[PDB]
Tab-separated table of C-alpha atoms in Angstrom:
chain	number	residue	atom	x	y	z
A	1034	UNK	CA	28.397	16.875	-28.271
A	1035	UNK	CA	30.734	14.420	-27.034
A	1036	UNK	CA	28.353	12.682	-24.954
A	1037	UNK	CA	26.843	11.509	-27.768
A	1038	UNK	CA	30.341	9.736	-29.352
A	1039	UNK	CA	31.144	6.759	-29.378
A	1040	UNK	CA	33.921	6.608	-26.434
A	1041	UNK	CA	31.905	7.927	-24.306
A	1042	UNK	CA	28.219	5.999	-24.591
A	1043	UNK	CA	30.528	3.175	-24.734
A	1044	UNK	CA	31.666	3.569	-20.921
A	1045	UNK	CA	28.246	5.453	-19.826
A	1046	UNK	CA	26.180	2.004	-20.520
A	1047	UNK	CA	28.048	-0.192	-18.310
A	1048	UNK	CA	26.851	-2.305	-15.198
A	1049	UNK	CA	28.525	-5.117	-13.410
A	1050	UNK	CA	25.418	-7.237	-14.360
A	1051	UNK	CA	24.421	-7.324	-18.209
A	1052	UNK	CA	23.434	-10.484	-17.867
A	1053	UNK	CA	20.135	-12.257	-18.797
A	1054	UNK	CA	18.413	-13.830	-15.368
A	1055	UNK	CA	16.345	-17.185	-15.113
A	1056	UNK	CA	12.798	-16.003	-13.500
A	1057	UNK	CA	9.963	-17.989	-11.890
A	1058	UNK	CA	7.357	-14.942	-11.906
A	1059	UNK	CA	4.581	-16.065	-9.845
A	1060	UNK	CA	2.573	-13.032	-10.576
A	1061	UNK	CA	2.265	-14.152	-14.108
A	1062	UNK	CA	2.968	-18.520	-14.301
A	1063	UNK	CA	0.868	-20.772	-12.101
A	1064	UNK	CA	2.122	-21.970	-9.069
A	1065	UNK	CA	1.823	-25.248	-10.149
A	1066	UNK	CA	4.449	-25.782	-12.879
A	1067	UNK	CA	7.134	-24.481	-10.173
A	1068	UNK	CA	8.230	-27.780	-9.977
A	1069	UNK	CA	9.189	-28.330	-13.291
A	1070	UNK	CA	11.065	-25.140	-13.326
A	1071	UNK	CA	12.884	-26.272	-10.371
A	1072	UNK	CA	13.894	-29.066	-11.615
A	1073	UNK	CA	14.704	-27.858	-14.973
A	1074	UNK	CA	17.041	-24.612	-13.505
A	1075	UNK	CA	19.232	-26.211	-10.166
A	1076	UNK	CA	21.341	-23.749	-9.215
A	1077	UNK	CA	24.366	-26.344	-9.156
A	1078	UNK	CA	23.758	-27.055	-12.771
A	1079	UNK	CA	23.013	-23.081	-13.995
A	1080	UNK	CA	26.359	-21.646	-14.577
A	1081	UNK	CA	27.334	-18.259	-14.697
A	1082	UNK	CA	28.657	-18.450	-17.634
A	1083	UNK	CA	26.555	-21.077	-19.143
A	1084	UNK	CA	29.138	-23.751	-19.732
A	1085	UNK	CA	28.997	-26.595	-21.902
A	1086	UNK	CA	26.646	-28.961	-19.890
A	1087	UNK	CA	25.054	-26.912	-18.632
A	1088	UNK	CA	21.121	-26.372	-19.083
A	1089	UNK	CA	21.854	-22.571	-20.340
A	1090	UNK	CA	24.131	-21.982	-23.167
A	1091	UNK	CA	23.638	-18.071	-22.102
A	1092	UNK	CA	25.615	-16.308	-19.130
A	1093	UNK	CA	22.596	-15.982	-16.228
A	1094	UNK	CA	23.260	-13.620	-13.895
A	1095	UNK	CA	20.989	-14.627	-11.359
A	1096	UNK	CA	18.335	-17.413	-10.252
A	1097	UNK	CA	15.194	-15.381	-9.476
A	1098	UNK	CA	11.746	-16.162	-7.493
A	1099	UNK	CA	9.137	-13.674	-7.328
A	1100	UNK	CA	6.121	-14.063	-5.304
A	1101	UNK	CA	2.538	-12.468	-5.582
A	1102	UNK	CA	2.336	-8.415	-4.761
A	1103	UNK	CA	6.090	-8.127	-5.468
A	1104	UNK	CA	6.701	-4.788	-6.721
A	1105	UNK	CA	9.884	-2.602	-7.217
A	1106	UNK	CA	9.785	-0.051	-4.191
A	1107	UNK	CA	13.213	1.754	-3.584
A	1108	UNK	CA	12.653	4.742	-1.408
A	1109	UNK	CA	14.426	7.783	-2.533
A	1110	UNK	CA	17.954	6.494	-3.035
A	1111	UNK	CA	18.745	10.035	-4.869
A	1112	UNK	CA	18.056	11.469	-1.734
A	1113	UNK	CA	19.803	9.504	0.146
A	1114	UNK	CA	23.314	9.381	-1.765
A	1115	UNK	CA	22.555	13.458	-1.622
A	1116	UNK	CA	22.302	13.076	1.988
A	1117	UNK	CA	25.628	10.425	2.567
A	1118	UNK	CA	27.826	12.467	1.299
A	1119	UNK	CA	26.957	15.649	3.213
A	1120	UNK	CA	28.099	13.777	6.628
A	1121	UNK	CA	31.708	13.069	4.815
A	1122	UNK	CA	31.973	16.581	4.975
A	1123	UNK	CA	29.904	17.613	7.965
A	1124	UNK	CA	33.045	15.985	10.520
A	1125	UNK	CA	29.773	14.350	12.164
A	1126	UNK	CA	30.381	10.985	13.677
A	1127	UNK	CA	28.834	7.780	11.529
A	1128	UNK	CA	27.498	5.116	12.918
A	1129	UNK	CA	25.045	2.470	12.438
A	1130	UNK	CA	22.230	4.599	14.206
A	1131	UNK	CA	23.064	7.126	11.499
A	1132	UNK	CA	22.684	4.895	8.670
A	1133	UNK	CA	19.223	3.529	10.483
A	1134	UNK	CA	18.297	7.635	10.125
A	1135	UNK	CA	18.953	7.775	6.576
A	1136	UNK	CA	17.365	5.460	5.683
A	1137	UNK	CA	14.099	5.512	7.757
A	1138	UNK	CA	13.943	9.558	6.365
A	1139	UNK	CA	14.540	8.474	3.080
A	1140	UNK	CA	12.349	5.321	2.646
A	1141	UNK	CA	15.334	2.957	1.856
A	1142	UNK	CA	13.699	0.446	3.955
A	1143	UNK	CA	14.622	-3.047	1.946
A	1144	UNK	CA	17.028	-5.426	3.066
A	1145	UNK	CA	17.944	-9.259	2.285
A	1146	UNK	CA	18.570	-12.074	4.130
A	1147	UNK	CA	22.295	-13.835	2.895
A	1148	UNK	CA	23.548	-17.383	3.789
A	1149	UNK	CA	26.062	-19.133	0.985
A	1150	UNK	CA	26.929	-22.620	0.032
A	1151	UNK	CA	28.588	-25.420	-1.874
A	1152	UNK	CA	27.326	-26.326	-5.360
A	1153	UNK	CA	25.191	-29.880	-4.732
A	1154	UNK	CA	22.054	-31.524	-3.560
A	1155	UNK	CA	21.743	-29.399	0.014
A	1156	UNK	CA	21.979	-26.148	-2.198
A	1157	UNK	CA	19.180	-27.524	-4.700
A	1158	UNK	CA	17.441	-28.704	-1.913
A	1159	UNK	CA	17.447	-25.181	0.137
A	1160	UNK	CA	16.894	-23.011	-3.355
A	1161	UNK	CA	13.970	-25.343	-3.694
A	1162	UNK	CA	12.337	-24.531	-0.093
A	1163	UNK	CA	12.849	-20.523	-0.332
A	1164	UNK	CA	11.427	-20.644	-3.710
A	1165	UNK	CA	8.240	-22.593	-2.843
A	1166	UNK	CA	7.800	-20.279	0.162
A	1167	UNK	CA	8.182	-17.564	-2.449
A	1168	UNK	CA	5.565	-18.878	-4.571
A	1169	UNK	CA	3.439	-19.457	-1.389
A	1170	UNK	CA	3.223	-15.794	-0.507
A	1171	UNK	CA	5.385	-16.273	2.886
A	1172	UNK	CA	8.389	-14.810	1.115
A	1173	UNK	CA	8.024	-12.193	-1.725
A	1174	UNK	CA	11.423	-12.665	-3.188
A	1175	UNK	CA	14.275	-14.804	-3.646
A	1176	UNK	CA	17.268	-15.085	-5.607
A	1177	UNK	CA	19.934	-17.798	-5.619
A	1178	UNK	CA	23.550	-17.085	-7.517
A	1179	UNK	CA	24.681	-19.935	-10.395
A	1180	UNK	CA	27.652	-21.545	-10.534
A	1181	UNK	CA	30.835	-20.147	-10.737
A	1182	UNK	CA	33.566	-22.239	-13.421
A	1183	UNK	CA	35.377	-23.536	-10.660
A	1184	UNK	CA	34.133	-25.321	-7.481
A	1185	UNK	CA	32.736	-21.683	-5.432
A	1186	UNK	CA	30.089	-20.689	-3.438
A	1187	UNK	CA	26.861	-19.845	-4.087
A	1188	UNK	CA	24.536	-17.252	-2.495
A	1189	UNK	CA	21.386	-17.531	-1.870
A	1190	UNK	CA	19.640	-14.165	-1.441
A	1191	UNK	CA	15.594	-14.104	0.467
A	1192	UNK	CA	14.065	-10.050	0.771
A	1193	UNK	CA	12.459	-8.438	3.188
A	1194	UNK	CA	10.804	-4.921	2.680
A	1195	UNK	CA	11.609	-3.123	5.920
A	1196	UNK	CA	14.421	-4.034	8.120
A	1197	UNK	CA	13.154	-1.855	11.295
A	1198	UNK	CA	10.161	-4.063	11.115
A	1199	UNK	CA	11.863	-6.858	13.696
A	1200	UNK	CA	8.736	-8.696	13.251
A	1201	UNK	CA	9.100	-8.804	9.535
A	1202	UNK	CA	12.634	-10.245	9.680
A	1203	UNK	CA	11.871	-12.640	12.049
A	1204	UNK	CA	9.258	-14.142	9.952
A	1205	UNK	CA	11.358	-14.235	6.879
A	1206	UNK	CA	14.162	-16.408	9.062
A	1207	UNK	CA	10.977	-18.663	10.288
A	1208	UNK	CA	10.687	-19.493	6.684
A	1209	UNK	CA	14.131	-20.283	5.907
A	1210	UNK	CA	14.587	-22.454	8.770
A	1211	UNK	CA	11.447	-24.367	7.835
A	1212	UNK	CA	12.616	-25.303	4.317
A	1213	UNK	CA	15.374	-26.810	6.340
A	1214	UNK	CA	18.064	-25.032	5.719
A	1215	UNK	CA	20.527	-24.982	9.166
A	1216	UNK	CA	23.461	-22.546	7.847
A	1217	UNK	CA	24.069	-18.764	9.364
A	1218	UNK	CA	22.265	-16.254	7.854
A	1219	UNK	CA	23.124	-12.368	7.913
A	1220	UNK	CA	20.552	-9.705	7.437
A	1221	UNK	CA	22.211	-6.963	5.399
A	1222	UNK	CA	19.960	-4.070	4.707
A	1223	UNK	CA	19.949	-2.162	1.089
A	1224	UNK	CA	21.402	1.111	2.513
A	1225	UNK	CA	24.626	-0.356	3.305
A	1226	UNK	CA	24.621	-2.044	-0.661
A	1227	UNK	CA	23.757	1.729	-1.440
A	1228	UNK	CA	25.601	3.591	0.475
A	1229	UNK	CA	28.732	1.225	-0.754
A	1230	UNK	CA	29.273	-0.120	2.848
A	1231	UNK	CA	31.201	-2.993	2.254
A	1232	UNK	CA	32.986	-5.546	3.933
A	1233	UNK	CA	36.508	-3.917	4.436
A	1234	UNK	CA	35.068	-0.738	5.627
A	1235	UNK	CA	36.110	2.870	5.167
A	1236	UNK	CA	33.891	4.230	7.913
A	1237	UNK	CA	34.972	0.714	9.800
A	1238	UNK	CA	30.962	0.025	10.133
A	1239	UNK	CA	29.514	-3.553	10.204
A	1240	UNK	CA	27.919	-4.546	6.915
A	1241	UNK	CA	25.180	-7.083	8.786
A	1242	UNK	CA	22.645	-5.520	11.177
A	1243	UNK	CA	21.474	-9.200	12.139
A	1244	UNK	CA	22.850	-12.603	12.161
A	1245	UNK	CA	21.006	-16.086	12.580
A	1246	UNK	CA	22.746	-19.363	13.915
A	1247	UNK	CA	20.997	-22.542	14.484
A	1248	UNK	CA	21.799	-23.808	17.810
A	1249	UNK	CA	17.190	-23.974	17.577
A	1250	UNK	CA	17.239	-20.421	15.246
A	1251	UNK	CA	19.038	-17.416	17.648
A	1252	UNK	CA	18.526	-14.501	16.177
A	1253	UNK	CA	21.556	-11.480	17.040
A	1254	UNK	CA	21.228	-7.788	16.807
A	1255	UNK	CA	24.546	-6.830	16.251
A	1256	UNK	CA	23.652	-3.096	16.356
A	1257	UNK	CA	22.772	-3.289	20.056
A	1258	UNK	CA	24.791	-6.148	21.165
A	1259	UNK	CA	20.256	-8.217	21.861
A	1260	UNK	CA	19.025	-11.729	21.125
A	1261	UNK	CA	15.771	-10.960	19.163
């Protein structure tokens, strides 16, 4: 029964996040004492590691914002994984159209918009804006990463259910724009975080389906080369 020793439950509980998070459920607390929590929890002040100084004395791993009707929905990422690693072997050519297959079959739909900066007021001040339009019901989720020991960058992380929905995206990047926030964002759907495609690529695939400069907010498909 070594399964059950100690060695082994020792490395068979592990993640990369073990972290408490600091939550704004909207689902469950009023909309109106968002403020408060706001300013209470700025992502420039909320450290990783919950330095001295800082308002946590407790390692956060993440910021998070959820909005009404949130609800976990992976597809059938089992299925999926199954299915991934039968193409390694199949030969078969991979490309982004065959990740957009997998994941359509398999109901992997999900995806996040990504956009990063410094630790200060324009990062508060952007956090701030996604989570109000969280708490609004024009975004259902948002995360923002705390701050790292030494100077960094942090993420700031806004969902999106299906990525094939163009519409959907679209909608997501109208919000982020009108909370101000001017920076490129990069649309990388959860397949690719699943199926561990990464930015130095073994299958030399892009890791962002979409990108989003403001010039005004242009909006690139980088699958087929297409201004939204």
């Amino acid at each position: 029964e070594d399964g059950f020793t100690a060695e082994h439950l020792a490395a068979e509980a592990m993640a990369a996040d073990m972290d408490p998070w600091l939550v704004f459920d909207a689902r469950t607390t009023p909309a109106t004492e968002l403020d408060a929590w706001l300013a209470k929890y700025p992502p420039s002040q909320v450290t990783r590691y919950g330095d001295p100084g800082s308002p946590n004395s407790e390692p956060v791993g993440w910021i998070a914002v959820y909005g009404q009707g949130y609800s976990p929905n992976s597809g059938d990422v089992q299925g999926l994984q199954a299915a991934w690693e039968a193409l390694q072997t199949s030969g078969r050519p991979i490309t982004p159209g065959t990740l957009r297959q997998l994941a359509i079959t398999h109901h992997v739909l999900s995806g996040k918009w990504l956009m990063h900066l410094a630790p200060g007021f324009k990062l508060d001040h952007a956090w701030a804006g996604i989570a109000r339009a969280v708490v609004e019901g024009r975004l259902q989720v948002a995360k923002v990463s705390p701050r790292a020991k030494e100077g960094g960058r942090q993420v700031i992380c806004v969902y999106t259910d299906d990525f094939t929905d163009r519409l959907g995206v679209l909608e997501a990047d109208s919000a982020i724009r009108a909370a101000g926030i001017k920076c490129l964002l990069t649309y990388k759907p959860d397949v690719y975080t699943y199926l561990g495609i990464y930015r130095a690529n073994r299958w030399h695939l892009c890791p962002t389906l979409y990108e989003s400069r403001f010039q005004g907010s242009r909006v690139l498909d980088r699958a087929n080369n297409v201004e939204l």
